[PDB]
């Protein structure tokens, strides 16, 4: 089912040209014991329709009741604990009732790190 991924999506801006996508598939973190995830490499040119169809139909995620996208900074260090409570006892606790997609940085930066741990705790 993932075979046509290099054909629908492209990797790498007038100095560059598009090429078939190479990095894709499922993703397992070594020794984390977490559920098997999914990942994809794609260019910024990609229109959202193909990616949304991929997520909803190939990866099998159901349509979300609501979507909240969290944007912020502070980079490395974790936020002050009242922001932590706003994330956990606020946004994530509310999203637990309706079911939702929470979109943010997928990195170990502070905001994404605390979003992930709050989602895991309520999971």
């Amino acid at each position: 089912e993932q075979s046509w991924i290099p054909k629908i999506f492209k990797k790498k801006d007038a100095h560059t040209t598009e090429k078939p996508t190479d990095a894709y598939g499922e993703l397992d973190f070594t020794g984390a014991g977490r559920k098997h995830s999914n990942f994809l490499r794609l260019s910024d040119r990609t229109d959202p329709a193909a990616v949304y169809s991929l997520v909803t139909r190939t990866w099998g995620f159901r349509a979300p009741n609501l979507v909240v996208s969290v944007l912020g900074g502070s980079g490395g260090p974790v936020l002050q604990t009242w922001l932590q409570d706003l994330l956990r006892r606020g946004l994530v606790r509310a999203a637990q009732s309706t079911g939702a997609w929470i979109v943010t940085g997928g990195l170990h930066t502070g905001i994404g790190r605390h979003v992930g741990v709050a989602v895991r705790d309520h999971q």
């Binding site: 349509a63 979300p64 009741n65 609501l66 979507v67 909240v68 996208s69 969290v70 944007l71 912020g72 900074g73 502070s74 936020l79 922001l83 706003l86 946004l91 905001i111």
Partner: protein
């Protein structure tokens, strides 16, 4: 889904680039939430909602006052 899917943006804080992000997310209509008391672009946008150059310098000491 045939129910519409609401989308919301939450702004904890930000640098000068988060102002551009908010402007782009506002021109293409998307509701935004600003966290009060967290400083940065969130507080800068919150305090004007509810000395303007002084405020902009207060939350962006190095910012370009006219462009901001």
């Amino acid at each position: 889904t045939g129910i519409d899917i609401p989308v919301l943006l939450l702004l904890i804080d930000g640098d000068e680039k988060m102002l551009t992000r908010i402007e782009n997310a506002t021109q293409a209509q998307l509701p935004c939430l600003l966290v009060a008391g967290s400083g940065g672009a969130a507080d800068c946008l919150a305090e004007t909602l509810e000395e303007a150059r002084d405020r902009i310098r207060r939350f962006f000491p190095k910012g370009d006052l006219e462009v901001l």
